[PDB]
Design an enzyme around this catalytic site. Structure first.
Site, mmCIF file in Angstrom:
data_model
loop_
_atom_site.group_PDB
_atom_site.id
_atom_site.type_symbol
_atom_site.label_atom_id
_atom_site.label_comp_id
_atom_site.label_asym_id
_atom_site.label_seq_id
_atom_site.Cartn_x
_atom_site.Cartn_y
_atom_site.Cartn_z
ATOM 1 N N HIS A 107 33.522 -2.572 61.304
ATOM 2 C CA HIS A 107 34.786 -1.829 61.489
ATOM 3 C C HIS A 107 34.574 -0.499 62.231
ATOM 4 O O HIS A 107 35.527 0.052 62.796
ATOM 5 C CB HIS A 107 35.557 -1.655 60.156
ATOM 6 N N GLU B 206 20.108 14.811 61.135
ATOM 7 C CA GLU B 206 21.093 15.829 60.787
ATOM 8 C C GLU B 206 21.030 16.264 59.317
ATOM 9 O O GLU B 206 20.592 15.504 58.453
ATOM 10 C CB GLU B 206 22.527 15.336 61.125
ATOM 11 N N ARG C 285 23.118 19.848 58.351
ATOM 12 C CA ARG C 285 24.363 20.621 58.426
ATOM 13 C C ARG C 285 24.861 20.518 59.867
ATOM 14 O O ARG C 285 24.162 20.924 60.807
ATOM 15 C CB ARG C 285 24.161 22.076 58.012
ATOM 16 N N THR D 51 25.376 23.845 62.379
ATOM 17 C CA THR D 51 24.231 24.663 62.813
ATOM 18 C C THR D 51 23.215 23.848 63.596
ATOM 19 O O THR D 51 22.798 22.771 63.159
ATOM 20 C CB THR D 51 23.569 25.337 61.585
ATOM 21 N N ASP E 210 18.574 23.866 61.044
ATOM 22 C CA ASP E 210 18.788 23.584 59.620
ATOM 23 C C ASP E 210 17.510 23.940 58.897
ATOM 24 O O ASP E 210 16.493 23.288 59.083
ATOM 25 C CB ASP E 210 19.178 22.112 59.398
ATOM 26 N N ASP F 269 31.629 -7.556 57.324
ATOM 27 C CA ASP F 269 31.754 -6.228 57.909
ATOM 28 C C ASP F 269 30.386 -5.588 58.117
ATOM 29 O O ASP F 269 29.938 -4.772 57.307
ATOM 30 C CB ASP F 269 32.688 -5.346 57.052
ATOM 31 N N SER G 108 31.966 6.208 56.346
ATOM 32 C CA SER G 108 32.507 4.901 56.716
ATOM 33 C C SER G 108 31.359 4.171 57.482
ATOM 34 O O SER G 108 30.770 4.751 58.384
ATOM 35 C CB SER G 108 33.710 5.079 57.638
HETATM 36 CA CA LIG Z 1 22.217 20.785 62.052
#
Ligand SMILES: [Ca+2]
Ligand SMILES: *[C@@H]1O[C@H](CO[C@@H]2O[C@@H](C)[C@@H](O)[C@@H](O)[C@@H]2O)[C@@H](O[C@@H]2O[C@H](CO)[C@@H](O[C@@H]3O[C@H](CO)[C@@H](O)[C@H](O)[C@@H]3O)[C@H](O)[C@H]2NC(C)=O)[C@H](O)[C@H]1NC(C)=O
Ligand SMILES: *[C@@H]1O[C@H](CO)[C@@H](O)[C@H](O)[C@H]1NC(C)=O
Length: 354
Positions: free
Chosen positions: A137, A153, A155, A158, A161, A197, A292
């Site tokens: 989806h 990743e 945050r 910024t 991190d 899915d 999701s």
């Molecule tokens: Ca970051």
């Protein structure tokens, strides 16, 4: 088509599979190669009769059901002693939803270019240096919009991190923003009813493993597939990414229960097959932490590894909503039912260049 029911030339019921996903065919081909010979003429004739088509450039043969195996071309990676998947220690227990910097290094953010701007609208998880596992989806009908993946990743807001290290600070390395070479949606994905899915995104280059970017393990054994329904509590981790973008600037995690399928069948007024898991609901801030298309993850015994490894047992499919409102139980794709499809799709599309 790939995985269609078939009858072998010798009358066994099976499925149309690549040779690398058929224990018996692969053994015969390997044994002849090891002896420095071709297979006998009568066996070459049997394979011609067993041939059930060519899909994505790979010859498929009817394989007896009990002889079907995960694609050996991909299992050689997943079983490699140096394949560092699902590695975690990770943090000391706090009551809230905080995640230690870089402690879920497989987490992926899916970026979409839409109304002249770009936003993260789905999650997923790295499964190899070139593949991200997500929900169909997140990918279906969105191939022109879905253009980048962000790995490493913590945050979003910024570029740096960091965390305190003594009287100074230690930062994670920069994030990786990578393109997508292939959008690989499950052939049986039902966009109307939301069934099967699952999708793979093949990255447009290899993203080598780093201290903050590593793959999650998959339930590649019978023991791990069986474990999915025996686990009482899972980690629901992410930035709460929906069609409205991320609800959290920072990576968060909650401990959420596996529920009986009846909880979802009653809430959604539809049958819930074994290919789906029913998770959480009835809370304000826990079930909603996931992205999701994001993973449902838990530690488990992976092959012969000493330390428990994080395994992706589910994919956020439906019912994961924004925090602050009472949620309904969520439907997740039961990953164990699709490891075969994952291995065959990665094999035909290539682990490295296409
Ligand atoms: Ca970051
Ligand atoms: C891997 O993919 C990245 C990211 O690009 C994205 O994924 C690709 C598979 C394609 O679908 C891209 O359309 C999609 O953005 C590639 O890096 C990107 O390359 C493109 C094209 O050369 C760059 O686009 C240009 O950007 C400039 C500057 O604003 C405009 O002037 C141009 O007209 C054009 O839009 C894009 O900036 C760049 N993005 C990043 C993050 O580097 C990368 O080339 C590709 N291949 C490899 C080997 O990594
Ligand atoms: C997206 O935002 C709208 C507007 O507030 C809300 O109706 C909706 O439930 C959000 N979608 C999800 C999946 O939470």
């Amino acid at each position: 088509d790939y995985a269609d029911d078939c009858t072998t030339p010798d009358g066994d019921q099976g499925q149309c599979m690549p040779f690398s996903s058929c224990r018996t065919i692969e053994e015969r081909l390997t044994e002849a190669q090891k002896a420095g010979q071709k297979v006998p003429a009568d066996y070459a004739s049997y394979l011609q009769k067993a041939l059930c088509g060519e899909f994505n450039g790979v010859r498929h043969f009817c394989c007896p059901s009990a002889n079907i195996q995960h694609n050996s071309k991909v299992m050689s990676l997943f079983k490699d002693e140096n394949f560092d998947c699902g590695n975690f220690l990770s943090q000391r227990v706090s009551n809230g939803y905080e995640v230690k910097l870089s402690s879920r290094p497989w987490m992926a953010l899916l970026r979409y270019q839409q109304f002249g701007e770009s936003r993260f609208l789905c999650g997923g998880a790295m499964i190899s240096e070139r593949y991200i596992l997500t929900a169909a989806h997140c990918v279906h009908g969105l191939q022109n919009d879905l253009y980048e993946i962000r790995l490493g990743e913590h945050r979003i807001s910024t570029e740096e991190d960091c965390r305190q290290q003594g009287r100074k600070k230690k930062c994670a390395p920069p994030v990786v923003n990578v393109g997508i070479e292939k959008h690989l949606i499950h052939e049986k994905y039902d966009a109307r009813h939301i069934m099967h899915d699952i999708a793979l995104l093949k990255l447009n280059r290899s993203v080598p493993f780093q201290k903050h970017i590593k793959p999650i393990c998959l339930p590649i054994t019978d023991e791990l597939k069986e474990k999915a329904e025996q686990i009482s509590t899972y980690f629901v981790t992410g930035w709460g990414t929906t069609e409205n973008g991320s609800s959290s600037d920072v990576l968060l995690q909650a401990n959420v229960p596996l529920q009986p399928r009846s909880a979802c069948s009653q809430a959604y007024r539809r049958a819930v097959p074994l290919s789906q898991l029913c998770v959480g609901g009835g809370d304000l801030q826990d079930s909603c932490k996931g992205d999701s298309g994001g993973p449902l993850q838990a530690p488990a015994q992976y092959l012969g590894e000493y330390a428990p490894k994080m395994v992706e047992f589910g994919i956020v499919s439906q019912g994961v909503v924004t925090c602050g409102q009472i949620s309904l139980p969520g439907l997740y794709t039961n990953v164990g039912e699709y490891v075969q499809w994952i291995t065959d799709t990665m094999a035909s599309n290539g682990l490295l260049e296409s």
